[PDB]
Protein backbone atom coordinates (compact mmCIF):
# COMPACT_ATOMS: atom_id res chain seq x y z
CA UNK A 1 0.00 0.00 0.00
CA UNK A 2 1.04 3.59 -0.68
CA UNK A 3 -0.54 7.08 -0.42
CA UNK A 4 -2.39 8.09 -3.62
CA UNK A 5 -2.83 11.72 -2.52
CA UNK A 6 -4.52 14.28 -0.27
CA UNK A 7 -6.94 17.06 -1.24
CA UNK A 8 -8.57 20.01 0.41
CA UNK A 9 -11.61 20.99 -1.78
CA UNK A 10 -12.34 24.28 -0.03
CA UNK A 11 -9.34 25.11 2.21
CA UNK A 12 -11.24 24.13 5.35
CA UNK A 13 -11.13 20.37 5.37
CA UNK A 14 -8.97 17.77 3.71
CA UNK A 15 -8.76 14.01 3.27
CA UNK A 16 -5.97 11.60 2.38
CA UNK A 17 -6.18 8.43 0.31
CA UNK A 18 -4.20 5.23 -0.40
CA UNK A 19 -4.40 1.81 -2.11
CA UNK A 20 -5.25 -3.41 8.59
CA UNK A 21 -3.79 -0.18 7.22
CA UNK A 22 -3.81 2.94 9.33
CA UNK A 23 -2.88 6.54 9.07
CA UNK A 24 -1.51 8.75 11.80
CA UNK A 25 -0.77 12.44 11.69
CA UNK A 26 1.21 15.07 13.47
CA UNK A 27 1.68 18.69 12.78
CA UNK A 28 3.69 21.70 13.88
CA UNK A 29 0.69 23.24 15.83
CA UNK A 30 1.61 24.31 19.44
CA UNK A 31 5.03 25.55 18.05
CA UNK A 32 7.63 22.92 17.06
CA UNK A 33 6.63 19.22 16.79
CA UNK A 34 4.99 18.51 20.11
CA UNK A 35 1.80 16.74 18.80
CA UNK A 36 1.91 13.02 19.70
CA UNK A 37 1.27 11.05 16.53
CA UNK A 38 -2.48 10.63 16.33
CA UNK A 39 -4.69 8.33 14.24
CA UNK A 40 -7.09 9.09 11.42
CA UNK A 41 -10.01 10.94 13.00
CA UNK A 42 -12.44 9.47 10.44
CA UNK A 43 -11.90 6.37 8.32
CA UNK A 44 -15.33 6.32 6.61
CA UNK A 45 -16.54 9.77 5.67
CA UNK A 46 -13.98 10.19 2.86
CA UNK A 47 -14.80 6.72 1.51
CA UNK A 48 -12.72 3.59 1.98
CA UNK A 49 -8.96 3.50 2.06
CA UNK A 50 -9.14 7.12 2.96
CA UNK A 51 -8.99 9.39 5.96
CA UNK A 52 -11.11 12.49 6.57
CA UNK A 53 -10.17 15.69 8.52
CA UNK A 54 -12.99 18.18 9.25
CA UNK A 55 -12.49 21.90 9.75
CA UNK A 56 -11.75 21.25 13.41
CA UNK A 57 -8.67 19.24 12.35
CA UNK A 58 -7.65 21.28 9.34
CA UNK A 59 -5.11 24.05 9.75
CA UNK A 60 -3.55 26.17 6.98
CA UNK A 61 0.02 27.38 6.62
CA UNK A 62 0.67 24.58 9.13
CA UNK A 63 3.00 21.58 8.41
CA UNK A 64 1.29 18.12 8.47
CA UNK A 65 3.04 14.80 8.12
CA UNK A 66 1.22 11.58 7.65
CA UNK A 67 2.28 8.01 8.08
CA UNK A 68 0.76 4.92 6.47
CA UNK A 69 1.14 1.99 8.89
CA UNK A 70 0.66 -1.58 7.66
CA UNK A 71 1.06 -5.12 8.97
CA UNK A 72 4.79 -4.53 9.48
CA UNK A 73 5.73 -0.97 10.45
CA UNK A 74 5.54 2.35 8.53
CA UNK A 75 4.73 1.84 4.85
CA UNK A 76 4.38 5.41 3.53
CA UNK A 77 4.98 8.89 4.91
CA UNK A 78 4.08 12.28 3.45
CA UNK A 79 4.45 15.84 4.53
CA UNK A 80 2.71 19.06 3.54
CA UNK A 81 0.57 22.05 4.60
CA UNK A 82 -3.02 22.30 3.33
CA UNK A 83 -2.63 25.05 0.64
CA UNK A 84 -0.32 22.75 -1.36
CA UNK A 85 -3.12 20.21 -1.43
CA UNK A 86 -6.01 22.53 -2.27
CA UNK A 87 -7.97 21.41 -5.31
CA UNK A 88 -11.25 23.31 -5.75
CA UNK A 89 -14.38 21.66 -7.09
CA UNK A 90 -15.32 22.23 -10.73
CA UNK A 91 -17.29 25.33 -11.60
CA UNK A 92 -20.95 24.92 -12.38
CA UNK A 93 -23.66 26.44 -14.54
CA UNK A 94 -21.54 26.75 -17.69
CA UNK A 95 -23.57 28.80 -20.23
CA UNK A 96 -22.85 30.82 -23.36
CA UNK A 97 -24.26 33.95 -24.90
CA UNK A 98 -23.93 34.97 -28.52
CA UNK A 99 -22.07 38.27 -28.83
CA UNK A 100 -21.88 39.06 -32.54
CA UNK A 101 -21.72 37.55 -36.02
CA UNK A 102 -19.71 38.99 -38.90
CA UNK A 103 -21.54 39.80 -42.10
CA UNK A 104 -19.35 37.28 -43.93
CA UNK A 105 -21.28 34.64 -41.97
CA UNK A 106 -18.03 32.83 -41.24
CA UNK A 107 -17.11 33.91 -37.75
CA UNK A 108 -18.72 34.53 -34.41
CA UNK A 109 -17.99 35.65 -30.91
CA UNK A 110 -19.52 34.19 -27.74
CA UNK A 111 -19.30 35.09 -24.04
CA UNK A 112 -18.83 32.08 -21.77
CA UNK A 113 -20.01 32.49 -18.20
CA UNK A 114 -20.16 30.11 -15.26
CA UNK A 115 -20.63 29.94 -11.49
CA UNK A 116 -18.14 29.33 -8.68
CA UNK A 117 -17.98 26.00 -6.82
CA UNK A 118 -20.61 26.09 -4.16
CA UNK A 119 -18.27 25.00 -1.29
CA UNK A 120 -15.63 27.70 -1.77
CA UNK A 121 -16.00 30.65 0.57
CA UNK A 122 -15.18 33.38 -1.98
CA UNK A 123 -18.08 35.58 -0.67
CA UNK A 124 -16.34 36.19 2.66
CA UNK A 125 -12.89 36.18 1.06
CA UNK A 126 -11.36 33.01 2.54
CA UNK A 127 -10.87 31.87 -1.03
CA UNK A 128 -9.86 33.63 -4.18
CA UNK A 129 -10.60 31.41 -7.17
CA UNK A 130 -8.88 31.46 -10.59
CA UNK A 131 -10.14 29.58 -13.68
CA UNK A 132 -8.84 28.12 -16.90
CA UNK A 133 -11.31 27.60 -19.76
CA UNK A 134 -10.52 25.43 -22.66
CA UNK A 135 -12.56 25.13 -25.80
CA UNK A 136 -12.22 23.19 -29.02
CA UNK A 137 -14.00 22.25 -32.20
CA UNK A 138 -15.92 19.10 -31.31
CA UNK A 139 -13.86 16.75 -33.57
CA UNK A 140 -10.45 17.93 -32.35
CA UNK A 141 -8.04 16.04 -30.06
CA UNK A 142 -6.13 19.04 -28.73
CA UNK A 143 -7.81 21.61 -26.47
CA UNK A 144 -7.06 25.38 -26.74
CA UNK A 145 -6.28 26.87 -23.30
CA UNK A 146 -7.13 30.41 -22.20
CA UNK A 147 -4.98 32.47 -19.81
CA UNK A 148 -6.22 32.19 -16.19
CA UNK A 149 -8.78 34.77 -15.33
CA UNK A 150 -10.25 35.69 -12.00
CA UNK A 151 -13.66 36.49 -13.43
CA UNK A 152 -16.55 33.97 -13.84
CA UNK A 153 -17.05 35.21 -17.44
CA UNK A 154 -15.05 35.55 -20.64
CA UNK A 155 -15.46 36.17 -24.32
CA UNK A 156 -14.31 33.59 -26.87
CA UNK A 157 -13.52 35.04 -30.31
CA UNK A 158 -13.56 34.09 -33.93
CA UNK A 159 -15.41 30.81 -33.72
CA UNK A 160 -16.41 29.27 -37.10
CA UNK A 161 -20.20 29.45 -37.20
CA UNK A 162 -20.22 26.31 -39.34
CA UNK A 163 -18.39 24.29 -36.65
CA UNK A 164 -19.60 23.00 -33.28
CA UNK A 165 -17.53 23.66 -30.25
CA UNK A 166 -17.32 22.37 -26.70
CA UNK A 167 -15.94 24.22 -23.63
CA UNK A 168 -14.74 23.04 -20.23
CA UNK A 169 -13.59 25.00 -17.16
CA UNK A 170 -11.02 24.24 -14.48
CA UNK A 171 -10.66 25.72 -11.01
CA UNK A 172 -7.64 26.56 -8.82
CA UNK A 173 -7.06 28.60 -5.63
CA UNK A 174 -5.32 31.85 -6.51
CA UNK A 175 -1.57 31.26 -5.86
CA UNK A 176 -1.70 27.75 -4.30
CA UNK A 177 -2.51 24.10 -4.81
CA UNK A 178 -3.51 22.74 -8.19
CA UNK A 179 -6.44 23.01 -10.56
CA UNK A 180 -9.45 20.86 -9.81
CA UNK A 181 -11.44 18.69 -12.14
CA UNK A 182 -13.00 20.12 -15.27
CA UNK A 183 -16.61 21.23 -15.15
CA UNK A 184 -19.25 19.59 -17.30
CA UNK A 185 -18.51 20.36 -20.91
CA UNK A 186 -20.68 22.96 -22.61
CA UNK A 187 -21.51 22.26 -26.25
CA UNK A 188 -21.81 25.23 -28.58
CA UNK A 189 -23.40 25.41 -31.96
CA UNK A 190 -23.61 28.74 -33.60
CA UNK A 191 -26.66 30.11 -35.59
CA UNK A 192 -26.91 28.19 -38.86
CA UNK A 193 -27.42 31.25 -41.13
Amino acid sequence: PKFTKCRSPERETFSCHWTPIQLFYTRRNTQEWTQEWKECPDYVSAGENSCYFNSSFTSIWIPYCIKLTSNGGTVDEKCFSVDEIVQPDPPIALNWTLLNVSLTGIHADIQVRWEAPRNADIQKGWMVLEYELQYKEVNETKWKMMDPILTTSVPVYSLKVDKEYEVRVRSKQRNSGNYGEFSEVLYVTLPQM
Binding site: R28, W61, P63, I122, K124, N175
Partner: protein, 160 residues
Amino acid sequence: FPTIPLSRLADNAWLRADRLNQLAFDTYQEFEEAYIPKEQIHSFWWNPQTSLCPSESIPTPSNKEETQQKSNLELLRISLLLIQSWLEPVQFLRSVFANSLVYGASDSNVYDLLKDLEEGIQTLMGRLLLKNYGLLYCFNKDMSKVSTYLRTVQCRSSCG
Protein backbone atom coordinates in the same frame (compact mmCIF):
# COMPACT_ATOMS: atom_id res chain seq x y z
CA PHE B 1 -16.97 59.30 -4.98
CA PRO B 2 -13.34 59.77 -3.93
CA THR B 3 -12.24 61.01 -0.46
CA ILE B 4 -10.85 57.68 -1.45
CA PRO B 5 -13.81 55.59 -0.30
CA LEU B 6 -12.90 52.57 1.77
CA SER B 7 -13.62 50.14 -1.03
CA ARG B 8 -10.83 51.85 -2.89
CA LEU B 9 -8.35 51.22 -0.03
CA ALA B 10 -9.33 47.60 0.49
CA ASP B 11 -9.42 46.85 -3.19
CA ASN B 12 -5.91 48.18 -3.75
CA ALA B 13 -4.48 46.78 -0.49
CA TRP B 14 -5.47 43.20 -1.45
CA LEU B 15 -4.47 43.49 -5.11
CA ARG B 16 -1.04 44.55 -3.85
CA ALA B 17 -0.97 41.60 -1.36
CA ASP B 18 -2.09 39.44 -4.17
CA ARG B 19 0.82 40.31 -6.44
CA LEU B 20 3.32 39.75 -3.63
CA ASN B 21 1.56 36.45 -3.30
CA GLN B 22 2.01 35.39 -6.89
CA LEU B 23 5.52 36.81 -6.79
CA ALA B 24 6.29 34.91 -3.54
CA PHE B 25 4.67 31.65 -4.71
CA ASP B 26 5.95 31.38 -8.24
CA THR B 27 9.60 32.15 -7.42
CA TYR B 28 9.22 29.61 -4.58
CA GLN B 29 7.96 26.95 -7.00
CA GLU B 30 10.55 27.91 -9.56
CA PHE B 31 13.44 27.75 -7.08
CA GLU B 32 12.42 24.28 -5.87
CA GLU B 33 11.47 23.06 -9.36
CA ALA B 34 15.03 23.94 -10.32
CA TYR B 35 17.34 23.40 -7.36
CA ILE B 36 15.71 21.09 -4.86
CA PRO B 37 16.10 17.28 -5.42
CA LYS B 38 12.73 15.41 -5.32
CA GLU B 39 14.01 13.80 -2.10
CA GLN B 40 14.82 17.15 -0.52
CA ILE B 41 11.35 18.69 -0.74
CA HIS B 42 10.51 20.64 2.48
CA SER B 43 13.89 19.77 3.95
CA PHE B 44 13.58 23.16 5.72
CA TRP B 45 10.94 22.09 8.22
CA TRP B 46 13.63 19.94 9.82
CA ASN B 47 17.03 21.69 9.90
CA PRO B 48 18.63 23.40 13.00
CA GLN B 49 19.02 26.76 11.22
CA THR B 50 16.35 27.18 8.49
CA SER B 51 13.37 25.96 10.58
CA LEU B 52 12.61 29.44 12.03
CA CYS B 53 10.66 32.15 10.16
CA PRO B 54 11.05 35.95 10.19
CA SER B 55 7.73 36.22 12.05
CA GLU B 56 7.54 33.15 14.26
CA SER B 57 6.61 35.57 17.02
CA ILE B 58 3.53 37.04 15.40
CA PRO B 59 -0.11 36.09 16.31
CA THR B 60 -1.70 34.36 13.36
CA PRO B 61 -5.12 32.79 12.69
CA SER B 62 -4.62 29.18 11.43
CA ASN B 63 -8.02 28.74 9.65
CA LYS B 64 -11.25 30.39 8.54
CA GLU B 65 -12.83 29.83 11.96
CA GLU B 66 -10.17 31.95 13.65
CA THR B 67 -9.60 34.43 10.83
CA GLN B 68 -13.25 35.47 10.42
CA GLN B 69 -13.54 35.83 14.24
CA LYS B 70 -10.83 38.49 14.16
CA SER B 71 -12.04 41.92 13.22
CA ASN B 72 -11.08 44.25 10.38
CA LEU B 73 -8.61 45.98 12.65
CA GLU B 74 -6.79 43.11 14.29
CA LEU B 75 -6.55 41.58 10.83
CA LEU B 76 -4.83 44.65 9.39
CA ARG B 77 -2.31 44.65 12.22
CA ILE B 78 -1.34 41.10 11.79
CA SER B 79 -0.96 41.92 8.10
CA LEU B 80 1.01 45.11 8.70
CA LEU B 81 3.15 43.38 11.35
CA LEU B 82 3.77 40.48 9.09
CA ILE B 83 4.67 42.87 6.26
CA GLN B 84 7.25 44.82 8.28
CA SER B 85 8.75 41.56 9.57
CA TRP B 86 9.86 41.09 6.01
CA LEU B 87 11.27 44.51 5.11
CA GLU B 88 14.90 43.69 5.94
CA PRO B 89 15.10 39.87 5.27
CA VAL B 90 13.21 39.96 1.92
CA GLN B 91 16.46 41.49 0.56
CA PHE B 92 18.31 38.29 1.39
CA LEU B 93 16.41 36.87 -1.55
CA ARG B 94 17.28 39.82 -3.77
CA SER B 95 19.55 37.70 -5.93
CA VAL B 96 16.96 34.89 -6.06
CA PHE B 97 14.47 37.44 -7.43
CA ALA B 98 17.05 38.86 -9.82
CA ASN B 99 18.21 35.56 -11.41
CA SER B 100 14.50 34.57 -11.68
CA LEU B 101 12.55 34.19 -14.94
CA VAL B 102 9.40 34.55 -12.94
CA TYR B 103 6.92 36.99 -14.35
CA GLY B 104 7.63 40.32 -12.69
CA ALA B 105 10.12 39.56 -9.94
CA SER B 106 13.46 40.97 -11.11
CA ASP B 107 14.91 44.36 -10.11
CA SER B 108 13.38 45.63 -6.89
CA ASN B 109 9.65 44.97 -7.43
CA VAL B 110 9.10 42.65 -4.41
CA TYR B 111 10.69 44.94 -1.81
CA ASP B 112 9.04 48.04 -3.31
CA LEU B 113 5.68 46.31 -3.27
CA LEU B 114 6.16 45.45 0.40
CA LYS B 115 6.74 49.12 1.16
CA ASP B 116 3.71 50.51 -0.71
CA LEU B 117 1.55 47.76 0.83
CA GLU B 118 2.80 48.75 4.28
CA GLU B 119 1.61 52.27 3.54
CA GLY B 120 -1.73 51.09 2.32
CA ILE B 121 -2.37 48.90 5.34
CA GLN B 122 -1.19 51.76 7.62
CA THR B 123 -3.62 54.15 5.91
CA LEU B 124 -6.62 51.73 6.25
CA MET B 125 -5.84 51.28 9.92
CA GLY B 126 -6.07 54.90 11.05
CA ARG B 127 -9.07 55.37 8.80
CA LEU B 128 -10.19 52.31 10.73
CA LEU B 129 20.92 27.06 -0.66
CA LEU B 130 18.43 25.35 1.64
CA LYS B 131 18.61 28.62 3.51
CA ASN B 132 17.31 30.32 0.36
CA TYR B 133 14.71 27.58 -0.05
CA GLY B 134 13.65 28.08 3.56
CA LEU B 135 13.17 31.82 3.24
CA LEU B 136 11.19 31.44 0.06
CA TYR B 137 8.78 29.03 1.83
CA CYS B 138 8.54 31.52 4.66
CA PHE B 139 7.92 34.54 2.42
CA ASN B 140 5.12 32.72 0.49
CA LYS B 141 3.35 31.49 3.66
CA ASP B 142 3.44 34.99 5.12
CA MET B 143 2.45 36.59 1.76
CA SER B 144 -0.49 34.14 1.58
CA LYS B 145 -1.41 35.13 5.08
CA VAL B 146 -1.46 38.79 4.26
CA SER B 147 -3.33 38.25 1.05
CA THR B 148 -5.86 35.98 2.75
CA TYR B 149 -6.38 38.41 5.67
CA LEU B 150 -6.79 41.54 3.58
CA ARG B 151 -9.15 39.75 1.24
CA THR B 152 -11.30 38.85 4.27
CA VAL B 153 -11.25 42.40 5.57
CA GLN B 154 -11.97 43.45 1.95
CA CYS B 155 -14.92 41.15 1.45
CA ARG B 156 -16.29 42.29 4.79
CA SER B 157 -17.03 45.86 3.83
CA SER B 158 -18.98 45.09 -3.27
CA CYS B 159 -17.77 41.52 -4.06
CA GLY B 160 -18.61 37.87 -4.93
